[PDB]
Amino acid sequence: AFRPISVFREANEDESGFTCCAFSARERFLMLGTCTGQLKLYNVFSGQEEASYNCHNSAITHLEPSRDGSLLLTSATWSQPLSALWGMKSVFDMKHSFTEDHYVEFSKHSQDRVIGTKGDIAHIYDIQTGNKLLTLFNPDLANNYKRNCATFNPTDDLVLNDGVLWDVRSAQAIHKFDKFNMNISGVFHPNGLEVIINTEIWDLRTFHLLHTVPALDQCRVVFNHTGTVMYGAMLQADLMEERMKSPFGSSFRTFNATDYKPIATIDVKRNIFDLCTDTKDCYLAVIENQGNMDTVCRLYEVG
Amino acid sequence: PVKPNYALKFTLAGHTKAVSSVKFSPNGEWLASSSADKLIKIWGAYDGKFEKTISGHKLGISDVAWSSDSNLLVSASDDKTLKIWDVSSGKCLKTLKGHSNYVFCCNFNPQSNLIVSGSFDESVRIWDVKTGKCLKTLPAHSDPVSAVHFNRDGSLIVSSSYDGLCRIWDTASGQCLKTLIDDDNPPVSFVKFSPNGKYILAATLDNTLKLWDYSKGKCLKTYTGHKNEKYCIFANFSVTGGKWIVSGSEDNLVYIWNLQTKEIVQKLQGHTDVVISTACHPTENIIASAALENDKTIKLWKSDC
């Protein structure tokens, strides 16, 4: 179901330091973050490094390009600014910085905003001015998820933060989901009608429990661009004074996005740093550790 | 040109994680070590014999320091505190709370009535040893603080930061009295006053050590050849015999330079991971080195000059 197509390691480096990836708008090219805070563009088929930019003073943890190719979000590890927004048209340069947000995402329908996470707190920013439009936090409703990531829903009208559903327009909390794990705060399903919070699938129409999916415990997920398949990989799991470990284990799984039934389990026999698919879902790129950190990017054909 | 002949005498095993800092007691009798394993250990400086373990920090310790009379220790921990310890009893006398993130570096003043600390939180704090209270919080830097040190008479503090600056502080007033920056501003990963108080020795994460006339803001000496781009490696003046500069290195060697001529005079091999800490014995030509998570040992070396 996943045929190896290409593999490459980081050019000009004793130990290869790829940490995360996303395809760029320009097609045979993948953007990769590295453990030295650099952003690199690579031809996924030849393995040729095409460009390199210094973005942060610590390792890149996560990145996200805008759908129109003009903008890029990055997040680092410990150095401030923890996240940044980069202009990609013409000269690659920093447009805005989010100095304390460990994680950021674009809004989804209209990509005119950024949502940042700082611990339990969500910040919503305007892309053009960089101004903080909203802070969302309520200490009575907080779940204190250790890996909380705030996120917009598909139509940008709702936010999930620390397991609390927020109405953006009114800046009001409309529902707190109970805490059933220590780490994962949950995401919106692309259909806009349910949320996936660790092993719990909650209906947004009623807040009833639609599904128990035990294989999603401690998982980050991403969907194909039609919203019909979901990829899931399990966080590795435990003080920033340690050597660099891969965020994920050695396997990912695909699920039917409508009923959460398993499709495939893929054990690559190496710890996983990141994975992504292209807008057409022809290709899957996975950052995999050889074996100490020494990563390669492996490109697979999506069958 | 005379060269030292440091040779390995003992390997001290016992910590179960990276060893962050080794320090000889001022009276020359003891070596104290701190570790990511949350423990402080005391060893015999001349025989390397384990003496005792001191415990209480809840997370890793990155630094430890002796009081002038060799009776007290202070330690700086990722648990956001420092602790003052009575060494002979092993008991925690005070826990210094106030930093909002990991405490990376600490030192007593020579008078032993003050402790200076530096933190990931970008501040330098001065604490009352006897009350355990923070006397001053200095907004020292705009990035994490990697080292702090009193000068010989305690009137000055020097601090170094990832912001690329070394800064000198008036102990009494807390006023910054000097900002040292040269041709670039790579992170300053280590700094300390020279024994005579006239100079500072500063490490930057560009594989470089620099001896500074901080009064005149002039760099007098530059030492290179080692590897140092990532870790905050402690360096030293060796003054018991020849006048050397000593530092660990990310290629797992101890480097020793001629202070005046800047040439490498010895490289000590043996460790199996970054040599992140070195210390020079107060009266004999003895060096302690300590290495990170894939080594976990301290080593004692002795030279005829």
A182 alpha-carbon distance from chain centroid: 19
What are the angstrom distances between the C-alpha of B195 and each of A49, B137, B163? 49, 26, 26
**B297 to chain A, closest Cα gap in Å:** 17
Name residues whose C-beta falls within 8 Å of residue A151's C-beta, 6 or more positions apart in sequence.
Answer: A105, A115, A159, A160, A161, A187, A188
For residue A103, what are its two tokens? 């994680």
Q: Tell me the structure's resolution in angstroms, rounded to a single decimal.
A: 2.0
For residue B159, what are its two tokens? 């601090």
Contact between B143 and A79 using a beta-carbon 8 Å cutoff = yes
Name residues whose C-beta falls within 8 Å of residue A94's C-beta, 6 or more positions apart in sequence.
Answer: A84, A85, A86, A87
Partnered with residue A94 across adjacent β-strands are A86
> Do B287 and B267 form a contact (C-beta atoms < 8 A)?
no
What are the angstrom distances between the C-alpha of A266 and each of A255, A286, A295? 12, 11, 18
Q: Which domains does chain B have, with CATH numbers?
A: 2-305 (2.130.10.10)
* Residues of B contacting chain A (CB within 8 angstroms): 18, 36, 59-60, 62, 78, 102, 120, 143, 162, 187, 293
Partnered with residue B188 across adjacent β-strands are B204
Q: Is A48 left (phi over 0), alpha (psi -120 to 50) or beta?
A: beta
What are the angstrom distances between the C-alpha of A244 and each of A139, A193, B249? 32, 37, 19
Cα–Cα distance measured from residue A250 to residue A245, given in angstroms and rounded to the nearest whole number:
12
Q: Which residues of B touch A79 (CB under 8 A)?
A: 143, 162
Q: Which residues of B touch A80 (CB under 8 A)?
A: 143
The set of long-range contacts for A199-206, using a CB threshold of 8 Å and a minimum separation of 24, is A201/A260, A202/A177, A204/A165
What are the angstrom distances between the C-alpha of B181 and each of B122, B162, B212, B290? 18, 12, 10, 29
Cα–Cα distance measured from residue A223 to residue A205, given in angstroms and rounded to the nearest whole number:
21
Q: Which residues of A touch B293 (CB under 8 A)?
A: 242-243
Contact between A239 and B293 using a beta-carbon 8 Å cutoff = no
- Per this entry, what is the length of chain A? 303
B52 alpha-carbon distance from chain centroid: 21
For residue B45, what are its two tokens? 């400086």
For residue B207, what are its two tokens? 């594989």
Q: What is the 3 state secondary structure string of A277-303?
A: ECCCCCEEEEEEECCCCCEEEEEEEEC
CA angle A68, A74, A77 (to 5 degrees): 165
Q: How many helices (H) and strands (E) does chain B have?
A: 0, 28
Of B241, B259, B295, B209, the C-alpha closest to B22 is B295
A85 alpha-carbon distance from chain centroid: 15
The alpha carbon dihedral of B100, B103, B104, B110 has a sign of positive
Q: What is the 3 state secondary structure string of A53-104?
A: EECCCCCCCEEEECCCCCEEEEECCCCCCCEEEEECCCCCEEEEEECCCCEE
Q: How many other CB atoms are found less than 10 A from the CB of residue A116? A: 25
Q: How many CA atoms lie within 13 A of A62 on its CB side?
A: 15
